[PDB]
C-alpha cells in the first residue's frame, strides 16, 4: 500500500537573544541509510525579518514554507504593505498546519 510520508532526517534549532535570534539547521538530506544531498538548505528567509524551517518529511516542509512565503506576499497586498509581526506569523502558521489536521504535514516547525 502506498505510504504518502517519508523521513528526510536532519535537525534544527532556534535561540533568541535580547536583540537578535538565530535559526540553525544542518544541510544533510537522507532517506533510509542513504544520503540524498550533503547541502540542501532547510532554513529560509521569508521576508519581514522572519526565518523559518519545517523539518521532518521534506516534501511537506517545502509545501508549508512555500505556502507561508505566499501568505506574507498576500498580507502585503491586502493590508497596505504592513509588516507581518512574528506573533502574527505564528498564528497564521497554526491555521496553515491545523487546516491539514486530518492529513497532517509531517514536520516540526520553528520560526
Amino acid at each position: 500500500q502506498f505510504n504518502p510520508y517519508g523521513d528526510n532526517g536532519g535537525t534544527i534549532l532556534g535561540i533568541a537573544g535580547e536583540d537578535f535570534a538565530v535559526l540553525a539547521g544542518d544541510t544533510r538530506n537522507i532517506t533510509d541509510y542513504s544520503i540524498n544531498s550533503r547541502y540542501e538548505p532547510k532554513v529560509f528567509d521569508c521576508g519581514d525579518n522572519i526565518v523559518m524551517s519545517a523539518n521532518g518529511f521534506a516534501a511537506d516542509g517545502d509545501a508549508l514554507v512555500k505556502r507561508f512565503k505566499n501568505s506574507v506576499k498576500w498580507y502585503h497586498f491586502d493590508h497596505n504593505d504592513k509588516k507581518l509581526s512574528i506573533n502574527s506569523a505564528a498564528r497564521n502558521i497554526q491555521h496553515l498546519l491545523y487546516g491539514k489536521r486530518f492529513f497532517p504535514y509531517y514536520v516540526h516547525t520553528i520560526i
Binding site: 512555500k66 505566499n70 506576499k73 497586498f77
Partner: protein
C-alpha cells in the same frame, strides 16, 4: 438606441453599444500616462479627490515584483482585474518558478474582458489600464481597454484630456526611448507628458502619483513628499 440594452446585442452597423458606454467611463477618468526606455518603464497618474476634505483616489496598483498598472474609470473593476493579474503572476511563480511575461499578462486580460462581452447578464469592465513591467525581454508598456483590445506601446495616456500627453509622447518619442540607465530623467519626461493634459489645475504633492519598474528596480510607487522632487 434599441440595441444598447445589453452586451449580447449587435447594432445594425455591427457595434456593441454597452462596450462603447464602458469605454466612455474611461474618458471621464482622471488622466494617466505611461512610457518606457530600454531599461525602465514609468507610470505617471493624476489623482482626484471628492472635495477638499477627502483623500485622493489611488490609481496605481502593484501586481508582482516586476509588474503593476494604473487605472482610469471604474476603480472597483480595476481592483477585480488587478487582483486577477496578481493571481496569474503568482500561479506562474508557484508552479513554474517563472515570472509572468508582460505579453502573456496582456493576453490574459484581453480574454477575461472578452468573456463579459459575449454572454447575457454580464457587463463589460468599465476601466482602462496601463501595464508596465520588466521581464526576460526587457521593459514593456501595455494599454488595456475593456473591449478586450490590448496594445504594446512605447508610451501612451488614457483618461480625460489624455490627447495632450499622447501627442507630446508622439513628438518626444526618439528622445525618451533612449533615456537608459537614468530613472529620474524618464520620470521627468513622463511628468512633462502628463502636464500637457492639465487644466485649471497643476501637479501638487498629494495630487501626483508615480511608479517605476526596470532593470535593477522592483515595481515601486511614489506618493506625497516622495514626488516633491519632480513637481
Amino acid at each position: 438606441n434599441n440595441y444598447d440594452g445589453d452586451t449580447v446585442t449587435f447594432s445594425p452597423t455591427g457595434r456593441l453599444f454597452q462596450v462603447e458606454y464602458a469605454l466612455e467611463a474611461i474618458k471621464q477618468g482622471s488622466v494617466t500616462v505611461g512610457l518606457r526606455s530600454n531599461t525602465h518603464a514609468v507610470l505617471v497618474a493624476l489623482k482626484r479627490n471628492a472635495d477638499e476634505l477627502s483623500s485622493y483616489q489611488k490609481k496605481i496598483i502593484k501586481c508582482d515584483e516586476h509588474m503593476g498598472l494604473s487605472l482610469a474609470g471604474l476603480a472597483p473593476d480595476a481592483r477585480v482585474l488587478s487582483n486577477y493579474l496578481r493571481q496569474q503572476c503568482n500561479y506562474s511563480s508557484l508552479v513554474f518558478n517563472r515570472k509572468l511575461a508582460v505579453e502573456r499578462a496582456g493576453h490574459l486580460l484581453c480574454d477575461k474582458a472578452q468573456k463579459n462581452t459575449q454572454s447575457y447578464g454580464g457587463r463589460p469592465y468599465g476601466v482602462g489600464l496601463l501595464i508596465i513591467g520588466y521581464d526576460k525581454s526587457g521593459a514593456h508598456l501595455l494599454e488595456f481597454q475593456p473591449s478586450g483590445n490590448v496594445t504594446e506601446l512605447y508610451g501612451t495616456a488614457i483618461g480625460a484630456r489624455s490627447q495632450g500627453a499622447k501627442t507630446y509622447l508622439e513628438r518626444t518619442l526618439d528622445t525618451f526611448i533612449k533615456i537608459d540607465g537614468n530613472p529620474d530623467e524618464l520620470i521627468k519626461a513622463g511628468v512633462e507628458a502628463i502636464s500637457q493634459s492639465l487644466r485649471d489645475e497643476s501637479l501638487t504633492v498629494d495630487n501626483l502619483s508615480i511608479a517605476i519598474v526596470g532593470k535593477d528596480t522592483p515595481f515601486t510607487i511614489y506618493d506625497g513628499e516622495a514626488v516633491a522632487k519632480y513637481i
